[PDB]
Amino acid sequence: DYSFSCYSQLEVQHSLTCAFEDPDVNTTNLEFEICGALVEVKCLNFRKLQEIYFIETKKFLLIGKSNICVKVGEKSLTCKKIDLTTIVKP
C-alpha cells in the first residue's frame, strides 16, 4: 500500500507536508491532493520535491478533518482524513 504521515506548520504561512512511509515508491506521475477546509476551490494539488509533497497556502479553513488523497492521473489511489491542528511538528 501507499500510506503516508503528514505534518503541518502554523503558529499564526500555513504549510502542510507529506512524506511517503513506503520505502521504495516510484513517486512518479502520482500527486497528492488536499480537499475540504479550503476557501475558493474544493480541492488543491500539492507540489513535489525529492520525495516529499508540500502545500503552502493561507487559504486553509483549519476546521474539521481534511481529506488528503493520492491521484495517478484522474483516478484516486488512496485517501485519509486528518485534522490539521493535530499534525504539528515540534
Epitope: E33, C35, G36, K42, C43, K65, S76, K80, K81
Partner: antibody, heavy 122, light 107 residues
Framework: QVQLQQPGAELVMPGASVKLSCKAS????????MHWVKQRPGEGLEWIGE????????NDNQKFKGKATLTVDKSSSTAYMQLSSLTSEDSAVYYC???????????????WGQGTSVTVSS | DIQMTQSPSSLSASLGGKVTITCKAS??????IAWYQHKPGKGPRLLIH???TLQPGIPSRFSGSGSGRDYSFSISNLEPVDIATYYC????????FGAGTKLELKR
C-alpha cells in the same frame, strides 16, 4: 449498468428506530460516495447527508442531527441510514444515490435509487 | 441553505419545441450546479452537471448555461419521453434543490 436497490416501502410505528438499506452493484464500493435525499409527498428534494465508504466519514445536514446516522458495511457493499425517534413528520420517500467520482466534500450525484416510501403511523 | 429559486413552477410547450428553466442562487455557487430529471414513480436521473457538461447517454438536445448566481437549462426538439419534473442542485457548500418544473406536452 449501476444498480442501487432499496426496499420499496416500510411501515414502522413512531417512537422506534429503523435502518434503511441501499445495496450497490456494478462498481467498486470504496471508490464512490453515497448521498441520501428525503422527499415529502408534495414537497421537493432535501439532502440529508453523505457518507464516505473508505473510512465512514460523514458530512450531514444539520437539520437531521440525531435523527439520521449514515453507516456503511463494506463487505456486503451496502450503505445504511438509521432513523431514530420516528414521528409523523418523518413519513417521506428516502432515495439513495451514488456520488460522482471526486475527493471533494460537497458534490452532486448521477445515478439514483428507487426510494423507500416510509409511512409512519400507529 | 443557499436558496435556489427555480422558475417557472410549471410550463408546457408543443411537440418538437424548446423549453427553458432558470435557477437563481442566493449567493455565488461558482458554477457548481446540476439539473435532474424526475419521472413519476422512478428515481431521478442526472442530465447536466457543472452548468453545461452533459452525461454519457444524454442526448445533445439538453443544453445548459449560466454564471455565478443565474443559470439556465433548455430542452430542444421536445419528444414525448420528456414528460417529467426538473430540479436544480447547488454543491458549493450544501445541496439545495429547486422548486421543480412540471413539463407538459401540448397535444
Amino acid at each position: 449498468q449501476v444498480q442501487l436497490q432499496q426496499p420499496g416501502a416500510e411501515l414502522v410505528m413512531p417512537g422506534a428506530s429503523v435502518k434503511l438499506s441501499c445495496k450497490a452493484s456494478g462498481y467498486t464500493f470504496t471508490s464512490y460516495w453515497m448521498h441520501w435525499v428525503k422527499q415529502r409527498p408534495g414537497e421537493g428534494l432535501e439532502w440529508i447527508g453523505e457518507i464516505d465508504p473508505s473510512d465512514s466519514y460523514t458530512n450531514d445536514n444539520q437539520k437531521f442531527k440525531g435523527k439520521a446516522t449514515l453507516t456503511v458495511d463494506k463487505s456486503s457493499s451496502t450503505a445504511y441510514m438509521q432513523l431514530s425517534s420516528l414521528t409523523s413528520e418523518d413519513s417521506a420517500v428516502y432515495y439513495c444515490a451514488r456520488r460522482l467520482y471526486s475527493n471533494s466534500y460537497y458534490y452532486a450525484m448521477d445515478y439514483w435509487g428507487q426510494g423507500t416510501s416510509v409511512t409512519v403511523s400507529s | 441553505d443557499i436558496q435556489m429559486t427555480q422558475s417557472p413552477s410549471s410550463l408546457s410547450a408543443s411537440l418538437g419545441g424548446k423549453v427553458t428553466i432558470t435557477c437563481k442562487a442566493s449567493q455565488d455557487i461558482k458554477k457548481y450546479i446540476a439539473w435532474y430529471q424526475h419521472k413519476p414513480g422512478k428515481g431521478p436521473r442526472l442530465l447536466i452537471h457543472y452548468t453545461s457538461t452533459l452525461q454519457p447517454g444524454i442526448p445533445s438536445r439538453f443544453s445548459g448555461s449560466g454564471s455565478g448566481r443565474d443559470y439556465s437549462f433548455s430542452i430542444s426538439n421536445l419528444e414525448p419521453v420528456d414528460i417529467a419534473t426538473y430540479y436544480c442542485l447547488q454543491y458549493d457548500n450544501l445541496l439545495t434543490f429547486g422548486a421543480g418544473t412540471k413539463l407538459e406536452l401540448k397535444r
